[PDB]
Amino acid sequence: RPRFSFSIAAREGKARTGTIEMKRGVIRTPAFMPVGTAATVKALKPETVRATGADIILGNTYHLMLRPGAERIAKLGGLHSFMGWDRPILTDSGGYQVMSLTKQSEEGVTFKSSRHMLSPERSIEIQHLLGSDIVMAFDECTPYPATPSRAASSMERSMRWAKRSRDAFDSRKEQAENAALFGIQQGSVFENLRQQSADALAEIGFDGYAVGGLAVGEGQDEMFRVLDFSVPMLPDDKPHYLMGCGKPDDIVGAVERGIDMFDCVGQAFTWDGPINIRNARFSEDLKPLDSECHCAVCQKWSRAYIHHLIRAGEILGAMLMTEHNIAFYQQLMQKIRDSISEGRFSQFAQDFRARYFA
Amino acid sequence: RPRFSFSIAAREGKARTGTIEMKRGVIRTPAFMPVGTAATVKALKPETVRATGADIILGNTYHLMLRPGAERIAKLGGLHSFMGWDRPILTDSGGYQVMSLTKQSEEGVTFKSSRHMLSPERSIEIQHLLGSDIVMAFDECTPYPATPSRAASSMERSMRWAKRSRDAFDSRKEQAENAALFGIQQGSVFENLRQQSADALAEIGFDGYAVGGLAVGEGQDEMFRVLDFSVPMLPDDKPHYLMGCGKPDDIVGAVERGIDMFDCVGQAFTWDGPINIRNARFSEDLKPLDSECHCAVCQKWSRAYIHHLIRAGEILGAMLMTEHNIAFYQQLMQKIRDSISEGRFSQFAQDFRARYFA
Ligand SMILES: [Zn+2]
Ligand SMILES: [Zn+2]
Predict the structure, then answer these.
(1) How many CB atoms lie within 10 A of CB A69?
(2) Three-state secondary-structure class, residue A133
(3) Chain A closest CA to B40's CA: distance in Å?
(4) Which residues, numbered 28 to 47 in chain B, qualify as contacts with chain A under a Cβ-Cβ cut-off of 8 Å?
(5) Inter-chain touch B319–A319, beta carbons under 8 Å
(6) B324 among annotated binding-site residues
(7) A230 CB neighbour count, 10 Å cutoff
(8) Where does the chain bind substrate (chains A, B)?
(9) Residue B330 annotated as lining a ligand binding site
């Protein structure tokens, strides 16, 4: 396989389906990437993650640099070897997590976990040490709400940092030849700033483009409104990645708006909407979590059992709930991919919402 | 298969190896039974429990009657169906756990979790509702240390309760025809009381005999001393079960003394003794938890990774540590079974201790 090749197989409106080929594997798009914060997808073996249908998982520059350490993971053979996942891994750059979980300057950010530094150069270096396949540019995630002046200043700094990310990536031969680099669009909810950001990123040139600065409390209506004008600003022939949860209804609407990639960190998803398994009404419910789901959890255990496990604080409860929820997300992505390929995605979206919100 | 058939295939000194046949499966002895407190073997799917080599698991009358409830589990189809384990299950009677985790009388014990009652009759009924395959008599676990007078009074009550357990079991046709009933020897550390207890239990007649009242703080030397004279008092042609951890060295010595069955609830077992994986010296150790172990954990992940997971409080850490530890115990039981079958168990015991304690 090549270092990176994005191919679009079919389209419906703004929606696309296709494949990203990378050295460690093929990624089917639209894709959902389970999040593996501390070098683990919570409560799941990698083999189980793969069994649910995941093609790629996400890791985080910030969390891994704190524990166990980036240099340490490199010495031990890299993140793939360390955690036992041999398929592509996307790593976030730390731009978000430092701020949510400190001293900022044009050079970068210094923070306390134990003091640490992040810059475009150090963030790209850490992702190299981890051995990540899709490297994210180091940005500044603009708080919401932001004034136009503040959003502009932040966006401009992020674009300067996008250039530094690009050059740091390119100057490291093993990384440039084997991994890909995605830029991150900023600009808050302002169309002109999003346009300037897209223009800057396209001029620099990246393997993919993320829509950053959303899923930060603005609500689905606002997110969709911003995606409406922001995604068409991005190069059409590269993947589009919406950063952040990422609930099932968010994913459907975002795919309708041209997004190709997604992530999201007692709640069980079903085609009839989410349920909270802790609720007393499930204590003697022999049905599986969802009636149609083909995951192993729904083939074997009842709502009643999982209700008991979660209530009792049992680890198996978390294992089963997580496997089901990630498998549900993958089944959603498969239905989306199939429906786009067959030119019936707009109908699928309508059907999905009718039932999910009934 | 029959309701219950214990066959001894080979012997070496006091040690025996053979099989217990029951309707839900065959149990190879000497056996280790993983403990599944709240209708789950902690952090493991039943399929994983089976993969480590377990033939039977343990459940508890006390814990299950409190949560989710015995009547509830019966309504939902029984414990096997509820948790997804279809092989034999042994259930303790509550005799121990009520006392460690209250008003006593000749009739039974009343306690607060929410007030509850246990008697020989109610304990046997609960085990029936759970659908357990090996039912334990309801006893009183004598505290240690105990005076001879107190040990005698307690032992005598337990023997009266053993008779009530027997009659309650026999009066319930579905239970008597499909499950087995084990009696529990008491008498503390006193030979004459252990003899009286064994005589009483043998006169009543049980499918198997447990040595109770040990693993309660007396230490290995004392436990072994008591097992030295207690086990030969038990009927030779029925299984002998030592209640309670149950560390690997305890198991070897207890098998040398004629015990057939065992249970035990950052520590990883290795053939060179236990290690605590949290220790900093494992932070960059690429070796598996144990060099010889053939479990899936040792085939795939390093000490360094598991060290990281446990330190970080990650659920996968618990999953991997538990799978390894239970698999190690099963590999120990297999080596014991093989060595007895081949008449070289006394040598194996010596070799095991030399290395484990080196
Ligand atoms: Zn499911
Ligand atoms: Zn192992």
Answers:
(1) 16
(2) coil
(3) 7
(4) 38-40, 42-45
(5) yes
(6) yes
(7) 28
(8) 92-96, 139, 186, 213
(9) no
Alpha-carbon gap: A276 to the closest alpha carbon of chain B (Å): 18
Q: Say how many Å lie between the CA of residue A298 and the centre of ligand 1.
A: 4
How close, in Å, is residue B298 to chain A by CA atoms? 12
Q: Is A295 left (phi over 0), alpha (psi -120 to 50) or beta?
A: beta
**Is the previous residue joined to A183 through a cis bond, with omega within 30 degrees of 0?**
no
CB contact under 8 A, A45 and B319: yes
Residue A236 identity (one-letter amino acid): D
| Residues contacting A98, CB < 8 A, separation 6+ | A62, A109, A111, A118
- Decide if B216 contacts B231 (C-beta within 8 A): no
The tokens for A332 are 């959603």
- Ligand closest to Cα of A332 equals 1
Q: What domains can you pick out in chain B, each with its CATH number? A: 1-358 (3.20.20.105)
Please choose, from the candidates A80, A165, A350, the residue with its C-alpha nearest in 3D space to the C-alpha of residue B301: A80
Of the candidates A76, A84, A319, which has its C-beta nearest B286's C-beta?
A: A76
B186 is in an annotated binding site: yes
SS3 state of residue A195: helix
B207 in catalytic set: no
* Contacts of B14 by beta carbon, 8 Å cutoff, 6+ apart: B231, B232, B256, B257, B258
B265 burial type by CB count under 10 A (0-12 exposed, 13-18 middle, 19+ buried): exposed
Breaks in chain A after residues (C–N exceeding 2.5 Å): 101, 113, 265
- What is the SS3 assignment for A104? strand
DSSP H or E stretch at residue A351: helix A345-356
Residue with the two structure tokens 């976990």? A113
Give the span between the Cα atoms of B352 and B358, in whole angstroms.
Answer: 10
Name the residue of chain B whose CA is nearest to A287's CA. B76
CB contact, 8 Å: B163 with chain A?
no
- List the alpha helices (DSSP H) in chain B: 46-51, 61-66, 70-75, 79-83, 97-100, 120-130, 148-170, 173-178, 191-204, 220-230, 248-255, 296-300, 303-312, 315-341, 345-356
**DSSP reduced 3-state for A159:** helix
Q: Does A269 touch chain B (CB under 8 A)?
A: no
Distance separating alpha carbons of residues B109 and A221, to the nearest angstrom: 61
Is A186 marked as a binding-site residue? Answer: yes
In chain B, what residues touch A72 (CB-CB under 8 Å)?
283-284
Strand arrangement of the beta sheet that strand B109-112 belongs to:
B103-104, B109-112, B115-118
In B313-342, the residues whose Cβ lies within 8 Å of chain A are: 314-316, 318-319
Chain B: nearest CA to A182, how far in angstroms?
29
Angle between helices A315-341 and A303-312 (to 10 degrees): 130
Q: Tell me the residue type at A181.
A: L
- Name the method of structure determination: X-ray
Q: After which residues is chain B broken (C to N over 2.5 A)?
A: 101, 113, 265
Contact A318 B315 (CB under 8 A): yes
CB B268 within 8 A of CB B279: no
Q: Which structure tokens are listed for B343?
A: 């008449």
Half-sphere exposure in the Cβ direction for B98 (13 Å, CA): 26
Q: Please name which ligand lies nearest the alpha carbon of B301.
A: 2
Resolution in A: 1.7
Q: Ligand 1: distance of its center to the CA of A266 in Å? A: 14
| The two structure tokens encoding residue A31 | 């894709």
Distance CA B337, CA B334 (A): 5
CB atoms within 10 A of CB B44: 24
